[PDB]
Design a protein around this ligand. Structure first.
Ligand code: SF4
Lengths: 98, 172, 50, 50
DNA sequence: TCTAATGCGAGCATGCTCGCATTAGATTTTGTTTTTTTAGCGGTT
């Protein structure tokens, strides 16, 4: 349990560290996001994995752009709202292109 | 709400007696001493002693536990000594203290709502007694919170003693 | 297995469940079985040790 | 009845287990210290030195 | 979930220990293990 914080501190001091770990893989943000992509490909009607992929550097939608997506359709699944924004939006906008 | 509308809602203006939690469960008794049936029943009963906050009065506690004559209560987290005064280990505070907390809540509501309308959506997880919201939160993959990554830090919240909290309320 | 035992509804089974589970679910009994089986597997004759 | 309390063999097994566990933690320490060739550092933390 | 601190009163030698009760705190895992053999298509429908 103490190993991670230690590794961080030693790197702060500049020392090279190597520890064989058996946990914490799914806490990595990269893993969480890449997984989220996989889930979304499996079934897009999962609001949180979708939103996760959207806000990720993969798409790069910001908070305003996200809330903008919601605005097109409030009651529906987030995926549907995304579909609708694509339907009503114009090619000129950046968010539409993302 | 119950106090502010008390006069209008049912008839007359009232005074904050206390806020109580009731633990709904079917407890198991862990006894090293052999217990008769009545003693078991009593221990089971004791397991349902309500936690929360009270107003320090002989009248208030006695009203909440009419069995209590002297000593500790098995219903409310308060007691009466031989002298008769409320004993210090009781979870009771002054009417003024109640008023302080109650005013404070509305302070929080006002500010929070204001920040909500202002468009504040910042990732600011707190950390108090090693406890964080993040574990109980489904949006960990949306926020993509990364402590290592700079400008992404927990809000240290102190496990301050109740007495202090009240002092700070007084100041504010 | 647990579904089959509940289905059968033998009094002995309920006498066990009541003792080693909490007041709202039976997960602790699940863990208990797992743990006991696992421990028994460290003997040459697990059944006999059981 | 809603009552529970340790049986004798439970307390025995508890005491026995504490012994065994402690003994092994000692062996763990022994392995740890015997690993070194030339230098050995021991870092531990405490509330109050005195 | 067990150890430690806090509170109060009864018996003892007006001030002190001790009993008891109770709550509240904080404090917290270790681990390893494989290979599966063995001889490309198919012209023409
Ligand atoms: S998970 Fe992301 S969002 Fe939910 S609390 Fe922790 S930080 Fe804020």
């Amino acid at each position: 349990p103490w190993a991670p914080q230690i590794m961080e501190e030693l790197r702060a001091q500049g020392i090279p560290v190597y520890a064989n770990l058996t946990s914490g893989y799914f806490e990595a943000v990269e893993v969480a996001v890449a997984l989220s992509v996989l889930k979304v490909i499996d079934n897009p009607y999962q609001d949180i994995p979708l939103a996760s992929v959207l806000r990720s550097p993969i798409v790069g939608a910001d908070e305003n752009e996200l809330s903008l997506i919601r605005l097109e359709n409030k009651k529906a699944p987030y995926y549907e709202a995304m579909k609708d924004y694509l339907a009503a939006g114009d090619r000129s906008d950046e968010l539409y292109q993302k | 709400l119950s106090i502010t509308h008390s006069a209008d809602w049912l008839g007359m203006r009232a005074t904050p007696a206390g806020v109580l939690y009731f633990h709904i469960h079917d407890p198991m008794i862990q006894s090293n001493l052999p217990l008769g049936l009545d003693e078991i029943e009593q221990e089971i009963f004791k397991k349902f002693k309500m936690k929360g906050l009270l107003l320090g009065d002989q009248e208030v506690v006695r009203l909440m536990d009419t069995t209590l004559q002297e000593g500790r209560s098995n219903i409310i987290n308060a007691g009466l000594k031989k002298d008769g005064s409320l004993r210090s280990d009781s979870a009771a505070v002054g009417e003024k203290e109640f008023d302080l907390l109650t005013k404070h809540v509305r302070r929080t509501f006002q500010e929070a709502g204001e920040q909500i309308t202002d468009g504040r959506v910042s990732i600011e997880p707190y950390k108090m007694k090693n406890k964080t919201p993040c574990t109980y939160c489904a949006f960990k993959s949306v926020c993509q919170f990364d402590e290592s990554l700079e400008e992404n830090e927990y809000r240290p919240l102190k496990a301050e003693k109740d007495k202090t909290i009240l002092e700070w309320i007084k100041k504010e | 297995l647990f579904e089959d035992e509940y289905a059968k509804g033998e009094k002995a089974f309920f006498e066990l469940v009541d003792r080693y589970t909490t007041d709202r679910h039976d997960l602790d009994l699940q863990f208990l079985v797992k743990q006991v089986y696992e421990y028994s597997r460290s003997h040459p004759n697990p059944e006999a040790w059981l | 009845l809603r009552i529970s309390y340790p049986t004798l063999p439970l307390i025995a097994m508890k005491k026995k287990m504490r012994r065994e566990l402690l003994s092994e933690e000692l062996r763990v320490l022994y392995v740890a210290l015997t690993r070194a060739k030339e230098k050995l550092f021991l870092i531990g933390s405490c509330k109050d030195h005195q």
